[PDB]
Design a protein around this ligand. Structure first.
Ligand SMILES: Nc1nc2c(ncn2[C@@H]2O[C@H](COP(=O)(O)OP(=O)(O)OP(O)(O)=S)[C@@H](O)[C@H]2O)c(=O)[nH]1
Length: 393
């Protein structure tokens, strides 16, 4: 099975009853980046050997997905992107539609036509052609009530390319508009057709990866940082899914129902901060949580102040005085409070226990408005395009 992180290693190593998750994701990747992500999700298995998430990958040609390793060929669906399905500016548009519907219907339904997932997790890299194109397509499909369940979009943001930036800003703007209409029409407590959008910033993940690993001068120079980024992003998502359902606490227990609400009710931008805490002291704890939020894999200058829900849990060792001290609890609370006053929004923070000697703090903020990365990207995009036009001879 896939053991994408030290935490997944420790879990399946000390827990042989990991046979269910909090929410049954139906994973669908689109474009190279998306496919790579979905291929990792397809690699996860329960203690009993069965597969965790049914997944499909999408792209234009068979060639694009030739190197997938966990998604069998049958599930590798092949067919700008918006034109094809557009019942007009592309003949037999319904053809592609019916095919998408059939493939989705055959992979996410049992024998009697019943959906076997709770929510669709669509992964894609913004900035590319098929990627952003699919993202934009997903929005129109949701507006057309295409999906039988809510959809969660996991999106990476580009950099270094003005053309990719512009494509990503167009999508984000379309996402934000969709969210505005959905937020006005649905009650703050109803399940939303667009559950959430989780953004990843390539520039941010690259810096994190290239700063670490290389305490000398040999950065290996051959390791694709993106592969490392994908592992970190996907294992975090998988981990937050299995923890609530497989781990409990003797104090504040976080349940799958809490996770489900957090992921489906807010309906806007959501982020995650995973902080491993081996050093059991207040300053190290605060510092690790803050780094995970402001300089972690899911950081994108989020508008934490606009969050409407939060959640999370510190998976801590049994019989560890540090994580049974009021000063610790107060530090965690006080630390999250610097991002968004918890007393003002729904949500809870649990402290599940696992059979290991270090703790991991998973902090989640949901229902936020446009990540400010939209702004820094629009600025960087303008600069690149300028130095581009400039210098030119
Ligand atoms: N985080 C992450 N980003 C990736 C990965 N592969 C590509 N990217 C980034 O994602 C963006 C789009 O990637 P890609 O998936 O190639 O787009 P696409 O539309 O599917 O490809 P095309 O149609 O332009 S060739 C680019 O900005 C690229 O730098 C990956 O495995 N992880």
């Amino acid at each position: 099975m896939l053991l994408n992180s030290n935490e997944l290693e420790h879990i399946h190593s000390t827990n042989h009853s990991v046979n269910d998750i909090s929410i049954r994701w139906g994973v669908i990747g689109a474009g190279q980046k998306g496919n790579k992500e979905a291929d990792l999700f397809a690699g996860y298995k329960f203690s009993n050997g069965t597969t965790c998430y049914p997944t499909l990958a999408v792209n234009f040609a068979e060639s694009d997905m030739m190197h997938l390793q966990n998604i069998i060929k049958e599930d590798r669906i092949h067919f700008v992107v918006t034109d094809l399905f557009d019942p007009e500016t592309n003949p037999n548009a319904n053809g592609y539609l019916d095919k998408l519907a059939q493939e989705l219907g055959r992979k996410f339904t049992n024998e009697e036509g019943e959906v076997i997932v709770d929510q669709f997790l669509i992964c894609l890299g913004a900035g590319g052609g098929v990627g952003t194109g699919w993202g934009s397509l997903v929005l129109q499909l949701i507006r057309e009530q295409f999906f039988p369940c809510p959809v969660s979009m996991l999106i990476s943001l580009p950099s270094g390319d003005p053309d990719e930036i512009n494509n990503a800003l167009v999508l984000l703007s379309e996402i934000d508009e969709f969210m505005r209409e959905q937020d006005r029409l649905f009650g703050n407590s109803d399940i939303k057709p667009l559950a959430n959008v989780i953004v990843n910033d390539n520039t941010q993940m690259q810096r994190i990866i290239e700063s670490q690993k290389g305490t000398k001068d040999l950065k290996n120079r051959y390791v694709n940082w993106k592969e490392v980024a994908n592992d970190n992003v996907v294992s975090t998502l998988h981990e937050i899914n299995i923890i609530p359902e497989n781990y409990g606490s003797d104090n504040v227990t976080y349940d799958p129902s809490d996770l489900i609400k957090l992921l489906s009710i807010p309906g806007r931008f959501l982020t995650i901060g995973k902080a491993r805490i081996a050093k059991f002291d207040l300053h190290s704890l605060e510092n690790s949580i803050k780094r995970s939020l402001d300089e972690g894999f899911f950081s994108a200058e989020h508008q934490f102040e606009t969050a409407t829900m939060y959640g999370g849990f510190v998976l801590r060792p049994s019989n560890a005085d540090f994580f049974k001290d009021v000063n610790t609890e107060n530090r965690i609370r006080n630390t999250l409070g610097e991002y968004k006053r918890l007393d003002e929004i729904a949500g809870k923070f649990g402290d599940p226990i696992w059979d290991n000697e270090y703790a991991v703090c998973y902090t989640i903020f949901a229902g936020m408005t446009m990540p400010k990365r939209y702004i820094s990207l629009a600025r960087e995009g303008k600069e690149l395009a300028e130095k581009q036009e400039q210098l030119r001879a």
